[PDB]
Amino acid sequence: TIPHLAIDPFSLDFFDDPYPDQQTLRDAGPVVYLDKWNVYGVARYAEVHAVLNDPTTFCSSRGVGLSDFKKEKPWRPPSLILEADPPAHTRPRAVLSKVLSPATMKTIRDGFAAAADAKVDELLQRGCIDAIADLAEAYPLSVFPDAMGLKQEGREHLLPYAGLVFNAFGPPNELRQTAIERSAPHQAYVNEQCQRPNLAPGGFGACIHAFTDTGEITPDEAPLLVRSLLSAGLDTTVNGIGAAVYCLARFPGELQRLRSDPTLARNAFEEAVRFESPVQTFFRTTTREVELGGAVIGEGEKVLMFLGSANRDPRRWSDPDLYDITRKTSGHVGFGSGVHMCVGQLVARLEGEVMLSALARKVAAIDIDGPVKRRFNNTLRGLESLPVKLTPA
Ligand code: HEM
Ligand SMILES: C=Cc1ccc(C(=O)O)cc1
Ligand SMILES: [Cl-]
Numbered sequence: 001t002i003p004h005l006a007i008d009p010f011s012l013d014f015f016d017d018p019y020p021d022q023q024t025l026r027d028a029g030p031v032v033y034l035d036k037w038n039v040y041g042v043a044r045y046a047e048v049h050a051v052l053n054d055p056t057t058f059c060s061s062r063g064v065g066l067s068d069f070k071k072e073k074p075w076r077p078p079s080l081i082l083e084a085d086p087p088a089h090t091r092p093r094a095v096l097s098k099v100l101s102p103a104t105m106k107t108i109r110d111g112f113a114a115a116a117d118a119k120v121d122e123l124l125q126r127g128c129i130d131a132i133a134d135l136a137e138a139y140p141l142s143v144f145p146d147a148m149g150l151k152q153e154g155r156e157h158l159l160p161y162a163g164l165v166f167n168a169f170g171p172p173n174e175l176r177q178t179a180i181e182r183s184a185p186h187q188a189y190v191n192e193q194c195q196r197p198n199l200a201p202g203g204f205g206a207c208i209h210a211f212t213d214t215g216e217i218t219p220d221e222a223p224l225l226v227r228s229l230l231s232a233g234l235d236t237t238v239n240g241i242g243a244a245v246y247c248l249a250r251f252p253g254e255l256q257r258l259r260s261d262p263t264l265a266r267n268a269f270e271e272a273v274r275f276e277s278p279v280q281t282f283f284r285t286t287t288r289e290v291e292l293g294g295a296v297i298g299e300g301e302k303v304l305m306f307l308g309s310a311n312r313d314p315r316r317w318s319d320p321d322l323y324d325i326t327r328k329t330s331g332h333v334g335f336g337s338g339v340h341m342c343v344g345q346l347v348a349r350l351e352g353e354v355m356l357s358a359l360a361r362k363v364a365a366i367d368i369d370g371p372v373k374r375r376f377n378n379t380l381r382g383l384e385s386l387p388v389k390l391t392p393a
Pocket of ligand 2: 079080081082083165227228229231232279
């Protein structure tokens with residue numbers, strides 16, 4: 001039998017401090033029923049990993065938010081990659097894989113790193129900064145829109161559109177309906193920049209459109225794949241870099257280990273993705289009746305996966321609530337797992353690595369010197385404001 005819990009994983013009280021409720025969710029059983037929203041939940045590593053790696057049974061084509069696309073209309077045309085199953089998913093995935101490939105990383109790495117060093121040097125001249133606005137947001141804003149090949153005007157829509165996208169995966173609570181109500185201008189901007197004429201040659205966007213003659217995608221599919229990168233590519237890395245700086249501020253012994261070996265930067269960022277998990281929850285929909293962890297779940301049922309909880313499950317991790325930059329992180333689900341595992345993870349890791357590398361070489365300490373403010377979102381975890389003082393090395 002399935003235990004029934006009344007915990008609302010989309011409530012502000014839950015966002016404010018999710019870990020006690022996540023333990024309650026893990027320890028209640030491998031599968032729980034959340035009466036507040038009539039969905040099944042899995043919060044342990046083993047079950048989250050199993051659901052992610054069974055796309056036939058736990059599909060994405062009926063949406064990865066609460067809404068079931070077989071019952072309700074999506075709020076925007078479905079993503080051709082995130083909200084598709086194999087085999088429809090395979091070829092657009094292949095394209096984005098080759099757009100966001102190792103060879104692409106080689107062409108952008110020097111410029112991404114130069115931009116990270118310049119930013120830290122500029123922030124060190126200020127001393128007292130907001131690590132969100134002035135670093136976690138400013139740095140990805142200074143590299144990603146240009147890497148995409150976006151024009152300069154209208155970029156103020158990028159972060160609002162992303163927050164709308166991740167809020168829309170949630171239930172129809174105030175967070176979701178508020179975001180959708182104010183969505184029209186951001187939707188208009190993003191959709192217009194997805195068209196080939198508006199994307200600079202050499203960028204990720206033009207590269208997607210240039211892939212439309214191999215037989216893997218058609219020209220009418222390319223704008224939606226550009227839309228995918230502009231939905232998923234910015235706010236996630238913003239919260240990821242914010243997580244990393246927040247972690248280095250709360251664990252000064254780890255900042256000091258990072259300083260002494262800056263080659264730890266890539267794993268320091270990976271551990272921050274596990275520790276804070278910028279993408280906290282995602283849904284699947286069962287395509288049949290299925291046994292999961294000794295539990296039978298009917299067909300057509302939504303299953304809420306707790307990625308951040310799987311990443312703190314003491315059944316899988318030693319000392320899961322410690323930030324440890326030399327941890328063996330392989331297997332964490334902060335980027336997902338299986339056929340949909342984050343196709344932009346090389347970009348994310350590049351941004352985070354070069355930013356933590358710059359801090360490792362230029363910063364002696366990071367001290368919180370003001371009120372920390374949390375940013376609330378139905379799917380994303382991160383901070384609104386992180387007042388810090390940077391001490392130059
Ligand atoms: C720290 C940063 C990031 C995190 C935590 C993150 C998280 C995730 C997760 C958990 C998934 C799996 C979704 C699912 O299984 O339903 C995913 C997929 C995806 N991500 Fe990321 N992501 C990050 C950065 C990026 C970047 C930088 C890009 C693009 C430049 C990107 C684009 C995508 C896309 C297009 C998908 C769909 C993949 C598919 O369905 O095959 N993400 N991301
Ligand atoms: C992991 C978040 C995510 C959001 C949007 C999309 C998309 O729009 O395809 C993909 C991934
Ligand atoms: Cl849209």
